[model samples]
Target chain A: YGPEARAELSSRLTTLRNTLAPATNDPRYLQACGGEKLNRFRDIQCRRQTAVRADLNANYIQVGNTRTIACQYPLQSQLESHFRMLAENRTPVLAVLASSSEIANQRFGMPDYFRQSGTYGSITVESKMTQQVGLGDGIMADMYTLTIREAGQKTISVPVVHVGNWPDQTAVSSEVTKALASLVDQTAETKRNMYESKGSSAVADDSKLRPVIHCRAGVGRTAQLIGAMCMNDSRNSQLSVEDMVSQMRVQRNGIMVQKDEQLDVLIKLAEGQGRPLLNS
Target chain B: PEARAELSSRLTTLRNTLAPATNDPRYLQACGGEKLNRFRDIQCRRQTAVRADLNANYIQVGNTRTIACQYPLQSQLESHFRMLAENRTPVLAVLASSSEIANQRFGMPDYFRQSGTYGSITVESKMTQQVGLGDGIMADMYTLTIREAGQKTISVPVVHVGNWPDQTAVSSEVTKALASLVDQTAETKRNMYESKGSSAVADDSKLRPVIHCRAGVGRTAQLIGAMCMNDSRNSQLSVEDMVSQMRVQRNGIMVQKDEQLDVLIKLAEGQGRPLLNS
Candidate 1:
């Protein structure tokens, strides 16, 4: 990355770190951030600062040089807490699930993640989208809305998009692969639309309302989707899939799309086949 | 103890092989003639049966599990060798990882090679290749000679594919390497049987090829499914059909990840194309 790129990325990362840092003055609750003894949930500085929580060694990843995003495996136990943390810290607007319910159940049950929200009370499906386009070879992408209804606090709605048919620990057919790219485009567009509805400055903030994507253990599919979205971000047309994935690995350890074939699908989608479909 | 009970409860359906059992004649016709058992007998001392490779957890794949045994500790080494001698139809190839990541994270080779007997297993020939499709996928092939008591020795071929990272999907290079490995292993097994004066090996008669990777679902099942396709090349079964047949033998084995099944479909599609000019 160029010096300018580094400057921009460093500034953005610092802003993200600052936003995610827990508020002080509440000594009762041990915060995830800034507790010198406790490990902080932060961007990995690539080779310089590589240590992360042992459990999160393979789960968390840092993507991009400028405007970096942390791709993570959402643990069932920490799902709600993590989301609440992200909402407080990162101001995330979306969470995308790239695994089927069968897979999500066998590995990381989605229901358990929501129900066991601890202090957040129970999460309810405020609205659900039943409409789905079956991308040939048994893959379907559906959208739904989840709201965290706390006792006295106002509700927070986080749109969750489930892409079914990408089996746990597996790949999808090329068509399904294209459909995945389309979903990412759709999500990115949704973010843009939301930002546009707000002030123009909110759109350029880059750190505002970031989206979190995950699959089972959040390695391959999550990284793939995130990488594609980053590459397709109109704000950065110069972004390459290679650069995006490389930076993601720097941010979080053990990010996937490890093979050329695995990457070819993303390249194809971000470059050509998966573009016009969404643009149309 | 509570955890074990919960795990046991979860696997109860897997134990009841007859629950919603298939009466389809194709179940028999699908191939690999072995009694379908939910578990294999492989024990590790100090490791609870609730462990990943617990006696109850090892999903049996070919009909050979009856003769299948884990690599032994010093105490069971002699006995395991004796069992190998008695069941000497042929070699017992264990296709699993010997790396620190697999062992430390999953208690793999250590779980099987309890007494450090794995060191005694002689390497006849070892070949390795970097499929170099760049996601760090590599293939390791070893022809090992396992020595038994009574001056008997068995040659086992071990193939370990590494750099799988985590479960998303394998690359074309990895899948291709897997396809070629299965083809090579199947041919060698056939040649061994033919050299023994048998026209063909009986389906009930066993020659063990113990294959595993992590949970023994993703890479393991994909390879076995590929082998089945190679074996049934003359048969009319499609790749999806073959995967379904494998599910009958062991639920969720061949289709653990949707992408793995996709690879099979791609492999089948590739094979359907003619490579030679008319």
Candidate 2:
């Protein structure tokens, strides 16, 4: 990131840290490096700092950068809290819907919750159900595209090609191979578009904003994406993907490392070629 | 003390057979179902009931007022459990032993003659489970149910006791069965959340999943029943849906203990899924 980019990131991160009190959670903070260290960069996410959120009400906190804030309180409390937080002046929520099933795949029609919430209000799907939708094959990209499009943005969502499990503990299964490939292709396309139209600001800004990826613990998967995004930002950025990945795992239990198969997949993804430049 | 110790040791030997990766079909059948009585060489049905009722008081649903039962069968218990959830007091149910939990495809715990691993895949851990008490199971059934009568929304959280020993063969089996359910369901649910970006309701975190066990040592079943009632606030659906499903799935679930049966009735008192009274 350039000086301007760094300024934005540093300042935003600081503000987020201040508001949420990340200090209570963790205390690790990576210092800015003067020179490139391919293997030394690590996550600056200090529990002392709250997970930064360009949009918290949407549960849209940057995985490592912003703590995925607590989901809305009660069904009604969540609705009211976000509305009041966003207010009429900010990024206004247009519509709100509550899904019927645990899996809220209502792409074709609207549900009663949305109907009652009024026109253009944001929909609130069950947290656990929503996570399920986000983790399945090729669904991440779809979710991103749909979320953006619904917000009336003409942007494409990118899916990160997941090479292995979060902590590089296991191999990817045949069933999940296509899912990772799809994510890679879609996410790359999304990143390229941002570069062409929105310029570097998109990368430096909410550049890492993509669909959620999590495994058993949510620690490893969270690290993998965040690490990739930072390392991919610029070839010679201060942190290395390995260092960042390792750092996150050290803090919380590595994501799904308990499962042997999951570990192998992570190692494979890290070793593969043309792991696209994250910010490329 | 000697009898309890002997019973606990015997149960340990039987439960050891439930390992997921290692357990085979021949053994799965040998270890699962009503055939277990043969191993002990005694009619343990009523004896099991006595221990089950005693253990019931150890658990609490949303509040101390509710007592979770672990009698009869897990499935029968689940019916009452659902009523508790529908009533609006979902409780935390634990699964500790494999002897109680059924193979996902086959509806019986290991260690009974009826239990048989049909397919290549068989293991208690691999199977779905409920919460575990400190993460293990014992032959003795213990649980905590939480639900208010006449409430629509749930209020309690079910805590599946983990890592305890099977004080009795029946209790051990029930724990494994229920715990397998809790673990599997939670895992699948978590996967969905990660992949789907689903919304989460703050109030009903425990409303994540519902579990059921077949009759007999429904010790784990009672735990789940209490959890649903506590979480759902003793809603009307807690009773109705569970019973209806039980009759449809397991024919006639046997509840040997009167207190276990009474608790089941109280949980099933609401509207929704019907339980088999006959």
Candidate 3:
């Protein structure tokens, strides 16, 4: 979009929403995941590999320099792969924008695996604690620990922060914004402690453990949260909200934010700051 | 308490239809509408209620080149701006914050950010600055050169009060800012009128400076009456008299809150127009 033609700071934000409206018009959404039983939805495309076409896929979406994994909620059969990916990538956080109940009931629900201890294929996943945050609204948010031990892979503890109250296809409510900001702040404090203890390294630095964001579609609030995190980064502040969402969308499979409400909330959080989120 | 719960539910039920279901449940409390006496007051009635004129929602202040009106809706700005261009209004004081308009929360848009051609009038944004309105009050001052087709271009300064939030009524904390609002508005009146004339109505005496907030009902009249009555000479009308003058023109009780009225009364009493205070 031309700068002179930029009649909208607000309207361009909505363009990010309108362009991604899936009506079988855009080529970005055509790849189907029906073949992959691991995918929760048929309409979303997987990017990794295929049983037939190496082009056809589901499960993995990576974007940006401090790249976020914008992947779908995994099916019951895909829990092992999901767990394995999180461990191998050294992902610091898996920000689930859905609750255990939403996973159980919502049409676009994933298999509710990460709520407590369970066996997914060979991985033994155990929850240590669930600390409530921003509880002015019931279950506004939750931060819990998931310790995963695979057969041969070393054990790792991934922090899972759940923002349960964000209903599908909605904007950021006050509670939702507070919860997301709290998770980022909590992560920041953790990083400060980790770095104070472990010096620095290009390869092993926890900085590489940028968040993995996912929900029902993994492209709406998933990417919207990513937009907020990206805005928090010193490198991304110069970028406009419209460009940031577009940048994330181009790097991923489909739309970054699915609606104007999501885009508006993202823009509102980015232009000003009251809370900080560690990219770690 | 279930008693408190029942009260909350009843209150919500009473006002929910008057507002969106998503509106703050305390909407009526901020309004002072929870009390039976206040429910009958003209303060709450003029708000959440209006008959805004189609082209311009302003009422001209008595015997002066000053107009007070509601900030226009995003869709109706063309006709509204057309009215400003036609009248050759040389100054527009917006009484809302930037975020309020940015979020479109109070139903107003950031009017000066983009240059637009509204019907026959063209508004070109020239420059903008963050102006300090003494006592830590902030304003966004925009300089725009507006001209209708086949008309002379009149440069106007829009002083948007950026920190006076709607949720707040007047207080001693903002008295200096309020005084400076009059000072700045008075400064623009003299400067623009001293050096300019009109294309549509070139009488120069006919140019009225414009003022508005969200609804053009509350803060709009408060600011208008302040400018009208702030003169050291005898405008002599009590604070109540000036409000009556604006109310008659606007077709509603102009200052729509006792908090707002109390502040204006104090302002007039302090400024030597206290008919009731005497």
Candidate 4:
């Protein structure tokens, strides 16, 4: 960044950092926060997606036409429900951001949902494929394809892209950010390719395959990935990262992109992917 | 203790997890409600709830009544300087951004001098030394003699730490300076305690060093909680326990922001012994 960009970024960061999160005690959120106990962190749950469908009790947020679900790492018991939601909803992509060391412990990570074919209650999941792809910098991902099967229901193939090189609590270096931008482009392309091939039946529906994004608390890295997706998408490219993030929080429980450093990463990503420089 | 690199990374994650909201229940418990918690000190009433508001910022947490407050405003020069003498505080740690500090953004005044008086208290800056506390940290030590209302003049050492800012995690400077300042406070108090028969300092417990920044809650809390854990290193007291206790003890939002929490958490599990070189 130039001196001007750096100065503006600093001012914006202070403003963003000071913006308070949504209050759960508010009447609008009290009912929506009912599924609180099921969340990994009691305070980090979402208030947007409620029991609209009794089968789905997970924390899912979809802002406007943004085809995505952002949530915290699922608990051991929550894995089945989340996977079931994916199968039922037909959401094709699940992006998990963490380091190899981060995922080793359940605190900042989650159990590998696509590790093996397994049956949870009425649903059966099959591990179809695994490919290790390296993004620049020390980042790598173990991309997986898992198919879900259920009685008298169409089986859905779900791709879990586990990005395991994001250093926790540290700002993303340009090398890693370029790598991160690649994740957004490739995943968006993958989603489109899969949806288009759904044989005109899927074409009847205007809605795209909404992907699910997650990190530990679902607020830090989770927010960045969503912001990246918005920056990459041509439709949302016109919107500022600040506007995208602010609108996302309004649509969900507040407190997205938890840190100034995290927001700085998104700004850098926006400066590159979107058609403008920060200072301008 | 964990390796410095290893411990630093783990602490970063744990620290980042903590999201700060001014109206948070724990924060509100000690600071009051929304508008009040964030700007309560701005309207410093009782100031201290007793004689003047000088001691209002002075919090007694975990048996230590150390003075921690926002940078003294021009109007508050009297109480602020007197509090240092009243508390018999030796070391005063001042934190601020070197750039903004020049413009008086933190509301500081030209209170430091070779000799000055605020109300009944008289202060004389005796020695000024600029020292480097490694890992790229530079600090200035100002030794001043303070005499209060016919009482004996006591030597006070003020440590103005410029590297520590209002936000982000603890810098390498703060990490290094933290240990040195803690030791400085302990030794000064210990020496004063030894001269009980010859000196007015009768009890070691009475010695409290002052630490302040813009709002005092953020940077001040970091130093307060960091010292608590650094001193308790032999006991391995968890930073979580120390901070939670701090909110209840003094200011509700003691480790006000996650960044400050990050600083304390890193300082808690950080490598000790020969704290300088590392």
RMSD of each: 16.3, 22.4, 18.1, 21.8
| lDDT of candidate 1 at residue B272, scale 0 to 100 | 71
Give the per-residue lDDT of model 1 (tens digit) for A65-110: 2332343444444444554544432333344454545444654344
Please give the TM-score that candidate 3 achieves against the real structure: 0.43
Full-model lDDT, candidate 4: 0.58
Q: How many angstroms is residue A241 displaced in model 1 relative to the true structure, after the best TM-score fit?
A: 18
TM-score of chain A of each: 0.59, 0.36, 0.73, 0.79
- Candidate 2 off by > 4 Å: A1-50, A54-144, A147-185, A191-217, A220-242, A250-260, A271-280, B1-278
Top candidate on lDDT is 4
Local accuracy by lDDT, each model: 0.44, 0.32, 0.57, 0.58
Pairs clashing in candidate 4? B47-B53, B48-B53, B48-B56
DockQ of each: 0.02, 0.01, 0.02, 0.01
Model 1: pairs clashing at backbone N, Cα or C within 3 Å: A61-A252, A62-A248, A62-A251, A62-A252, A63-A248, A171-B259, A258-B135, B73-B115
Candidate 3, residues A196-229: lDDT per residue as tens digits?
A: 4765342365334556678776877776677766
Docking tier of model 1: it is: incorrect
TM-score of candidate 2 relative to the true fold = 0.25
Q: Judge candidate 1 against the unseen true structure and give its global Cα lDDT, from 0 to 1.
A: 0.44
Q: List where candidate 4 sits over 4 angstroms from the true fold.
A: A1-25, A30-36, A49-66, A106-109, A200-208, A273-280, B1-278
